[PDB]
Amino acid sequence: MRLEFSIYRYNPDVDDAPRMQDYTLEADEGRDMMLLDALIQLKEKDPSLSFRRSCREGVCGSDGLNMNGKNGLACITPISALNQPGKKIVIRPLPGLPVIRDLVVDMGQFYAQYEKIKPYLLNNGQNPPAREHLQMPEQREKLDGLYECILCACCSTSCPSFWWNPDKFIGPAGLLAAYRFLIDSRDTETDSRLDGLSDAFSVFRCHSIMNCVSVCPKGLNPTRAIGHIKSMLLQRNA
Amino acid sequence: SNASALGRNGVHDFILVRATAIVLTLYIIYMVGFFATSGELTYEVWIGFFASAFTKVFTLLALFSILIHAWIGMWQVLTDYVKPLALRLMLQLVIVVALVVYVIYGFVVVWGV
Amino acid sequence: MKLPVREFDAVVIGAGGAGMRAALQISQSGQTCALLSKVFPTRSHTVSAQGGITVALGNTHEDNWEWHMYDTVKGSDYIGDQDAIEYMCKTGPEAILELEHMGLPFSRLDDGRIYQRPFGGQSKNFGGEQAARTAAAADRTGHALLHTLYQQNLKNHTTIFSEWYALDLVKNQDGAVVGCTALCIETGEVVYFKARATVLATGGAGRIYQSTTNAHINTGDGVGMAIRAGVPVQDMEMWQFHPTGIAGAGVLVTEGCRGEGGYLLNKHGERFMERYAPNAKDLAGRDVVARSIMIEIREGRGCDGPWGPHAKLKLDHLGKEVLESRLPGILELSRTFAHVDPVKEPIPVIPTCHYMMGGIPTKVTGQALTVNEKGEDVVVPGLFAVGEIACVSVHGANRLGGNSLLDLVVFGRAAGLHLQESIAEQGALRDASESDVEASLDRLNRWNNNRNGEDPVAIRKALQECMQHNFSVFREGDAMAKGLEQLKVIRERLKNARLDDTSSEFNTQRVECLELDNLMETAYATAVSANFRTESRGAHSRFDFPDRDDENWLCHSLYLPESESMTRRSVNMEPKLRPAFPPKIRTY
Amino acid sequence: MIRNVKKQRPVNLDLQTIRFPITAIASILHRVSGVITFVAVGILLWLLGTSLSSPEGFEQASAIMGSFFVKFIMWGILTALAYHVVVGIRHMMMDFGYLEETFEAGKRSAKISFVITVVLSLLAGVLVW
Numbered sequence A: 001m002r003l004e005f006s007i008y009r010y011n012p013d014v015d016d017a018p019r020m021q022d023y024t025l026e027a028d029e030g031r032d033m034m035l036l037d038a039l040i041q042l043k044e045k046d047p048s049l050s051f052r053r054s055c056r057e058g059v060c061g062s063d064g065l066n067m068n069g070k071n072g073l074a075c076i077t078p079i080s081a082l083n084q085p086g087k088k089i090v091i092r093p094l095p096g097l098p099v100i101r102d103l104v105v106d107m108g109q110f111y112a113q114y115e116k117i118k119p120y121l122l123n124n125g126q127n128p129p130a131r132e133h134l135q136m137p138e139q140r141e142k143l144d145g146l147y148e149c150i151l152c153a154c155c156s157t158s159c160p161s162f163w164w165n166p167d168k169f170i171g172p173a174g175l176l177a178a179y180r181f182l183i184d185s186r187d188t189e190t191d192s193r194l195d196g197l198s199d200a201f202s203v204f205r206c207h208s209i210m211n212c213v214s215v216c217p218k219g220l221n222p223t224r225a226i227g228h229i230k231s232m233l234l235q236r237n238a
Numbered sequence B: 001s002n003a004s005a006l007g008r009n010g011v012h013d014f015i016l017v018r019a020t021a022i023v024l025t026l027y028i029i030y031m032v033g034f035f036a037t038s039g040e041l042t043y044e045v046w047i048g049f050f051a052s053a054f055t056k057v058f059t060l061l062a063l064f065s066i067l068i069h070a071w072i073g074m075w076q077v078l079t080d081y082v083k084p085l086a087l088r089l090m091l092q093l094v095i096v097v098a099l100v101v102y103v104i105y106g107f108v109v110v111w112g113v
Numbered sequence C: 001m002k003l004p005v006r007e008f009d010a011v012v013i014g015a016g017g018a019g020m021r022a023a024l025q026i027s028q029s030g031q032t033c034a035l036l037s038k039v040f041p042t043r044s045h046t047v048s049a050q051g052g053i054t055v056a057l058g059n060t061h062e063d064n065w066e067w068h069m070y071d072t073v074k075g076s077d078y079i080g081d082q083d084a085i086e087y088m089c090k091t092g093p094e095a096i097l098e099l100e101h102m103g104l105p106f107s108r109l110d111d112g113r114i115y116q117r118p119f120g121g122q123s124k125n126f127g128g129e130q131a132a133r134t135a136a137a138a139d140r141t142g143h144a145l146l147h148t149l150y151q152q153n154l155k156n157h158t159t160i161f162s163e164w165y166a167l168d169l170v171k172n173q174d175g176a177v178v179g180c181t182a183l184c185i186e187t188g189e190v191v192y193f194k195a196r197a198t199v200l201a202t203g204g205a206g207r208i209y210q211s212t213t214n215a216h217i218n219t220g221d222g223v224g225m226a227i228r229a230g231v232p233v234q235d236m237e238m239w240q241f242h243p244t245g246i247a248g249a250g251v252l253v254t255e256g257c258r259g260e261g262g263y264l265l266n267k268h269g270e271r272f273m274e275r276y277a278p279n280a281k282d283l284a285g286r287d288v289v290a291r292s293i294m295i296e297i298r299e300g301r302g303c304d305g306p307w308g309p310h311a312k313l314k315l316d317h318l319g320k321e322v323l324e325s326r327l328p329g330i331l332e333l334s335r336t337f338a339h340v341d342p343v344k345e346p347i348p349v350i351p352t353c354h355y356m357m358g359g360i361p362t363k364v365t366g367q368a369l370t371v372n373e374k375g376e377d378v379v380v381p382g383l384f385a386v387g388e389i390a391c392v393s394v395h396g397a398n399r400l401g402g403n404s405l406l407d408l409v410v411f412g413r414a415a416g417l418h419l420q421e422s423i424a425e426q427g428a429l430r431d432a433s434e435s436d437v438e439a440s441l442d443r444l445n446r447w448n449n450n451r452n453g454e455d456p457v458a459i460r461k462a463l464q465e466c467m468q469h470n471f472s473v474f475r476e477g478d479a480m481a482k483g484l485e486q487l488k489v490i491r492e493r494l495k496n497a498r499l500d501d502t503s504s505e506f507n508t509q510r511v512e513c514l515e516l517d518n519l520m521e522t523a524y525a526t527a528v529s530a531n532f533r534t535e536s537r538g539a540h541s542r543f544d545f546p547d548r549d550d551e552n553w554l555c556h557s558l559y560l561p562e563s564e565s566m567t568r569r570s571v572n573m574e575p576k577l578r579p580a581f582p583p584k585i586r587t588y
Numbered sequence D: 001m002i003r004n005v006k007k008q009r010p011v012n013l014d015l016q017t018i019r020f021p022i023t024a025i026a027s028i029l030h031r032v033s034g035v036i037t038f039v040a041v042g043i044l045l046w047l048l049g050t051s052l053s054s055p056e057g058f059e060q061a062s063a064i065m066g067s068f069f070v071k072f073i074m075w076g077i078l079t080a081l082a083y084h085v086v087v088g089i090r091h092m093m094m095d096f097g098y099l100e101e102t103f104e105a106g107k108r109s110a111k112i113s114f115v116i117t118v119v120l121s122l123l124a125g126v127l128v129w
């Protein structure tokens, strides 16, 4: 059928303030397509419309966008889920972050917090393994749901606490990642890591709102991981 | 360690809030259970309920718990919305003084009954 | 002199699997280095890798690197260098275990329904190996590897220029590569990155087809920059079409399925792969297993439906548990794209474009080579290549499964470990006149002043179509012939193509356009090559020449650029090594 | 734009543009309820003050509570307070572990909470009367 789209537009050198632009992409009513598909077509009609995209299969994290008020990946959000007769399909950039152009936001602050938590293994080197490290399936199982994060930023972009303290509160993604190392048998700085997170913002700004779990493409659960971090903190600081 | 935050650190704040929450929930139940077992409240019944060592001591433990709890609480809120330093400090000052006065007035009211 | 300059002792163009493994190694060596990328590093195609990394570790069962050489040489069709392969397979373990010490989320061994063994990287059964030597961490081995690697560049504080578009390389008066030029996608500014070493790691470009497993990013910018500069490309017709791509989707599904015990069946219920490769079964080589299913479609005996003429990749028989534990990434891409839960129904799979075996010819040390007047290998000063953009001649004419990732790390690291030595060798390289630098800015200037030209979409669309039909799994002279000409037509067409967006703040169009040129030069070389070869080898299958020419075509077809001037085609080869190795019969 | 330095990028932050789960509503009300209750205590202390000062005082308080306008306010205070306790307890439970941290488990907690709140709110109204 026909499709009425509502898309966020902005260009520092032409516009001085954002505006929502009307789009009509008459598509074949054959089957369902992803929102990325639409955009790519619309961009043929209109070149100026810019947005990020790549793996195209829900695995790179590039196409994070707020669709009809909810964050998700354009590469895997079916037009079915977003089509309602008479009403338009509102597509906007991820909330809170600064807008570089059209639907492209500066992800800077996002990556920052990620680094703050030391996203890499830390092994004092004491007791070197002959070959690889000793990791029993049961120990490795603990990483599941903590290493598949794609840094799409749908989560952090949906959290009010992160809107207010972009640089103080680490945010869902960053905490999920912190936990990934806190419970890695291979990592030997877990107590050092916990001391680094004991301030008032890093971790405790999380109010268990659960919007992060709500929108995670990979179905990850940062709230739960943050809850475990908090527990470690109590074990170590009380 | 943030100067306005009661807690020395995060975890400290986490605990203080949860401990006072608990103490305050008991107290509330205590006060509720009384009113739901009163019906028509006479001046004799009212003052009788407070002239009680137990009620005095609980009421003051509550107020004191409120200072700690509402302090950490209002603090977290101000940290989110009042970004201009000068303004926020004024508020915290107004708030903490208020909380302290709540407790002081509590003592004054209690020994006076 | 109005163009900005950024001097580095190195410039690694590409943040893919190999691009980062190198940037990391080059940095460990106390060398100043800038790492560039079109997207955020964690977004490179590598993140999408599934299967795993095939290296002889001996975990799953005792093994030696030589079996890895035999399994592989026969896999390439004795078109892949014994010197290079040897080095890769041998240096395999150490290099991989290196990654585990970096924190790579490998799967582990010990208890399983009917299995049991210690903490080793879990090695899965895979295509082209007698037994299971594929180190895999769930279905997402690439995502694991890429991310670990990025976390590493974070630790060692590597200088990263994210979302910068490299245009064309800059040549020295003496004909050396001395850096490159690039576009800051964010702001739009153009800059010349001057370097004593310029490493290309721009991955493949399967985007020259209509149905590929690659990402919208794989436009072989690398290939285009090498040709437009004067650097050749080896075996640029050798393209591996993956056996189990999703019908109608073009989205990949791991070979590990067959590895965990997956069936590749036909509508008549038979396992045609058992009949094609009578003893090797579904484990049969890449090139081979493709034509099998593709053939069942030629005879009108291929399964059909909404998705299209597919083959059934039955897995449901395996436990829903095993599928969720071992292939979680598969159970979702199927549902999401194929609308079929593998736990209960087979998957609409079809051979689709996958790995590009061809690319810039290089020594094990990652250095780039061109032929001499006589036709002798001559290294190119200031230029190196690693990853998929490079034909070190390891996969030859058929890339064994899970070896590409093994390639990335090994030669990626090989390039780094050897950089300082290589610079010493080429010695000093002189500056570039604004002329040299100005030259590279040509492609860019063109697009920006031309606005009344032709709409790129069509040119792009056509480009892909032609390649799809004339250079598919099976091809023939008459075909290439036609396409080879259509291409010329299009290549001229593309010269008048226009650019609608002339903005600065993140111009997706400008970038896609500039990538088109590469799509063009890439597809082109691909063709002139495909046509040229008179034999049916690995992925190359001509109905006109059904057998492999051992005496005539046992060599690397070198595409001979002259930038945009008129082309040429030559040859190359590598039989010597340490333990020795003979050509033979190739029955999978 | 500071003095002689321009352009500050825009931000998507129109709340009417963002769709908020029930769980997000649940917690923000907990925050609001808290600030209401902060103020509430003062008011209640004042009343308690009058109430106990003397007989004439207890009379003056009994009558203030007579105003139906006042009855409405004394009613919200207790409802706000009630909301806050319930959601607070819900909060503390997930913390420890008497509630799943899954999203579904989360919406269920939230819903049951509002229900108990409404009920207590009704009871509060019966008392104010």
Ligand SMILES: CCCCCCCCCCCCCCC(O)O[C@H](COC(O)CCCCC)COP(=O)(O)OC[C@H](O)COP(=O)(O)OC[C@@H](COC(O)CCCCCCCCCCCC)O[C@H](O)CCCCCCCCCCCCCC
Residues within 6 Å of the ligand: B024, B028, B029, B031, B032, B035, B036, B037, B038, B039, B040, B041, B059, B062, B063, B066, D041, D044, D045, D047, D048, D051, D058, D061, D062, D063, D065, D078, D079, D081, D082, D085, D120, D121, D123, D124, D126, D127, D128, D129
């Ligand atoms: C598990 C979690 C626990 C929940 C926690 C949540 C708590 C908040 C929710 C509040 C719920 C309250 C529920 C009350 C209740 O149950 O009412 C009951 C109703 O039960 C039914 O309807 C039966 C149905 C059964 C179905 C199964 C009993 O009500 P009655 O029938 O007696 O009705 C009054 C009557 O008309 C007859 O009324 P009256 O004529 O006697 O009234 C007189 C009127 C005026 O008297 C005065 O002037 C004295 C005022 C004294 C005020 C003292 C304030 C104390 C402040 C302390 C602060 C300490 C820091 O009296 C008023 O109407 C009485 C108002 C009482 C308000 C009490 C508020 C509780 C405050 C607790 C402390 C707060 C802490 C803040 C940090």
Ligand SMILES: *Cc1cc2c(cc1C)nc1c(=O)[nH]c(=O)nc-1n2C[C@H](O)[C@H](O)[C@H](O)COP(=O)(O)OP(=O)(O)OC[C@H]1O[C@@H](n2cnc3c(N)ncnc32)[C@H](O)[C@@H]1O
Residues within 6 Å of the ligand: C013, C014, C015, C016, C017, C018, C019, C036, C037, C038, C039, C041, C044, C045, C046, C047, C048, C049, C050, C051, C052, C053, C141, C142, C164, C165, C166, C167, C201, C202, C203, C204, C213, C214, C215, C217, C218, C221, C222, C252, C355, C386, C387, C388, C389, C401, C402, C403, C404, C405, C406, C408
């Ligand atoms: C597509 C695919 C491939 C794949 C696989 C699954 C899929 C869906 N599973 C594999 C597996 O299990 N085992 C294996 O051995 N290989 C597997 N493959 C193939 C493999 O992923 C590739 O060979 C490999 O990823 C290539 O890595 P490389 O690092 O060489 O390339 P890349 O990851 O594609 O990244 C290229 C980088 O270069 C940047 N770039 C490109 N052009 C430019 C310009 N002009 N300027 C600046 N940077 C540029 C990219 O942005 C990217 O960072």
Ligand code: HEM
Residues within 6 Å of the ligand: A207, B017, B020, B021, B022, B024, B025, B028, B066, B069, B070, B072, B073, B074, B076, B077, D030, D031, D034, D035, D037, D038, D039, D084, D085, D086, D087, D088, D089, D091, D092
């Ligand atoms: C004396 C009456 C009370 C007042 C004035 C009060 C005030 C506050 C304030 C201002 C906050 C912080 C707002 C926020 O950041 O969300 C808060 C949070 C909280 N309160 Fe209370 N409170 C009171 C009673 C209670 C009681 C009785 C409980 C126990 C059920 C409780 C449990 C909690 C919890 C768990 C939080 C944490 C919310 C978060 O971290 O987001 N409160 N309170």
Ligand SMILES: CCCCCC(C)c1cc([N+](=O)[O-])cc([N+](=O)[O-])c1O
Residues within 6 Å of the ligand: A160, A161, A207, A209, B080, D015, D020, D023, D024, D025, D027, D028, D031, D032
């Ligand atoms: C009067 C309250 C206004 C709240 C506005 C916004 C955007 C908000 C929304 C949620 N939420 O959970 O949906 C949480 C917080 N908050 O400060 O915790 C928050 O500030």
Ligand SMILES: O=C([O-])CC(=O)C(=O)O
Residues within 6 Å of the ligand: C049, C050, C051, C052, C253, C254, C255, C256, C355, C400, C401, C402, C403, C404
């Ligand atoms: O390219 C390969 O190595 C095969 C692969 O990833 C897969 O089958 O998933």
Ligand code: SF4
Residues within 6 Å of the ligand: A148, A149, A150, A151, A152, A153, A154, A155, A156, A172, A173, A176, A215, A216, A217, A218, A219, A220, A222
């Ligand atoms: S946890 Fe989920 S939503 Fe959050 S950044 Fe990672 S993939 Fe994105």
Ligand code: F3S
Residues within 6 Å of the ligand: A158, A159, A160, A161, A171, A172, A205, A206, A207, A208, A209, A210, A211, A212, A213, A222, A223, A226
């Ligand atoms: S939404 Fe934000 S407040 Fe916590 S529960 Fe998720 S990180």
Ligand code: FES
Residues within 6 Å of the ligand: A053, A054, A055, A056, A057, A058, A059, A060, A061, A062, A063, A073, A074, A075, A076
């Ligand atoms: S394009 Fe990568 S997940 Fe959407």
Ligand SMILES: [Ca+2]
Residues within 6 Å of the ligand: A182, A184, A185, A187, A188, A189, A190
């Ligand atoms: Ca530890």
Ligand SMILES: [Ca+2]
Residues within 6 Å of the ligand: C356, C357, C358, C359, C387, C388, C389, C390, C391, C392, C395
């Ligand atoms: Ca290659």
